[PDB]
């Protein structure tokens, strides 16, 4: 009855691995929702991301995403009702895994400080229709 | 609620390092060394880790041993006799053990470290 971690990870039935790769660069598109008096809705929440607090199980992120007047920072949990959630434009060069400082002063200097990683795109294009080769053999 | 994390103490960061690093320094310098019991225990932990890193000889690990100690001389002695002997004795290379009396003149439990190959 040792290995307590193992136990607490055995009750982790939820195996959300069907989510793409995301890092303190950006995320972009979509999430889930509730709204209606009885469930039913899907609202699309994009934006530029922020924090990644990790527990493997609980682990959640938070996204900046800015609106009309001012912005909002939204903390999303990595493991169930978020449905597909799947990102769009990744980018990054997260020169630091802590995007608090943008919550302060950031407007045009948002972009000026948030760089991009073509690298990742190249990777996505690799895994793209090389998965067409798995639609052939191995 | 505290000491839930634990750590042998007294002094301060500056002197924590200073005492660890220098007692380690003067440790490998001579090989077998007398001191106080607690200082002894945590010291031997520290320099033990240092020697497991010494098991390799790659630049990075070496300078990093010099982050703690000093003489590249002492790092030659490190990586030329000692560190290559425990080549197949890994984890735990310190024999610190108690001693009779206590350091009279203040009443304090004694201990002593060894090479341990």
């Amino acid at each position: 009855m040792n290995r307590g971690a193992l136990i607490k990870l055995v009750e982790s039935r939820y195996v959300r691995t069907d989510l793409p790769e995301f890092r303190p660069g950006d995320t972009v598109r979509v999430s889930y929702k509730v709204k209606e008096g009885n469930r039913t809705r899907i609202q699309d929440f994009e934006g530029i991301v922020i924090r990644i607090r990790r527990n493997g199980f609980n682990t959640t992120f938070t996204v900046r995403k800015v609106s009309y007047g001012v912005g909002v920072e939204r903390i999303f949990p990595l493991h169930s009702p978020l449905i597909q959630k799947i990102d769009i434009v990744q980018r990054g060069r997260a020169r630091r895994a802590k995007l608090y400082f943008i919550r302060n002063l950031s407007d045009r200097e948002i972009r000026r400080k948030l760089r991009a990683d073509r690298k990742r795109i190249d990777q996505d294009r690799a895994a793209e229709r090389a998965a067409k080769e798995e639609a052939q053999k191995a | 609620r505290h000491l839930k994390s634990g750590r042998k103490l007294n002094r301060h960061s500056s002197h924590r390092l200073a005492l660890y690093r220098n007692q380690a320094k003067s440790l490998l310098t001579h090989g077998r060394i007398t001191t106080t019991v607690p200082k002894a225990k945590e010291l031997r932990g520290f320099v033990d880790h240092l020697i497991h890193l010494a098991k390799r000889g790659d630049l990075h690990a070496r300078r990093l041993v010099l982050r703690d100690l000093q003489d590249v001389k002492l790092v030659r002695k490190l990586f030329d006799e000692i560190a290559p002997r425990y080549r197949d004795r890994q984890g735990g290379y310190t024999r610190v053990l108690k001693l009779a009396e206590r350091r009279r003149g203040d009443g304090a439990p004694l201990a002593l470290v060894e090479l341990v190959e």
Binding site: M1, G4, I7, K8, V10, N58 | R1
Partner: protein, 205 residues
């Protein structure tokens, strides 16, 4: 009017329903029946349950290995659940499907000597202005020359922590009888690695 032993495992948040749940899980453990208690011979109604079997040489003496049914000893003794009487078996979890709130009785983490500030929650004073002298002192006690004394059980500068605590009423989220897990709404006293028992609660009639 029911019960079973256990030990503190996790505290997490299982996304049950569509609501997150702070969830204490408790390894209830296969706690075997042994020396029973009747009110004709003892004076009440309880059952003895040893926790986890780890006992050989280092046990020694009597054993309710004697009893009539053995099992040697756990590794950390046995306890008595009042109002209890099974049916001649060993027990772990199955006796509780979800939907059955239960009180959870466990030891509590220890805070050694507790300052009155972090015990009965006091002010201490001002963060300047007056004197830095008191600042975090329990203020004053009773009146002058009458009372003439201090109050027996007055909230004071003393100990807090190493205590027995019974918590009350928590939804048993689910039961894992394939192993030994009993997951309920998160709370539970003590460290993530200390003994804790389960007992059926009192609500309706």
């Amino acid at each position: 009017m029911k019960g079973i032993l256990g030990v503190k495992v996790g505290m997490t948040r299982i996304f049950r329903d569509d609501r997150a749940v702070p969830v204490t899980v408790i390894l209830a453990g296969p706690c075997p029946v042994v020396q029973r208690r009747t009110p004709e011979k003892d004076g009440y109604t309880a059952v003895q349950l040893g926790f986890l079997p780890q006992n050989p040489k280092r046990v020694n003496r009597p054993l309710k290995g004697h009893f009539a049914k053995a099992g040697v000893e756990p590794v950390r003794i046995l306890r008595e659940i009042r109002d209890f009487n099974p049916e001649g078996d060993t027990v772990t979890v199955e006796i509780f499907k979800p939907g059955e709130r239960v009180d959870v009785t466990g030891t509590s983490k220890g805070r050694g000597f507790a300052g009155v500030m972090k015990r009965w929650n006091f002010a201490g004073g001002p963060d300047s202005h007056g004197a830095h002298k008191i600042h975090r002192h329990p203020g004053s006690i009773g009146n002058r020359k009458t009372p003439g004394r201090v109050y027996k059980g007055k909230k004071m500068a003393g100990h807090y922590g190493a205590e027995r605590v019974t918590v009350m009423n928590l939804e048993v989220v689910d039961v894992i009888p394939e192993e030994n897990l009993l997951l309920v709404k998160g709370a539970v006293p003590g460290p993530n690695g200390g003994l804790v028992i389960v007992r059926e609660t009192k609500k309706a009639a």
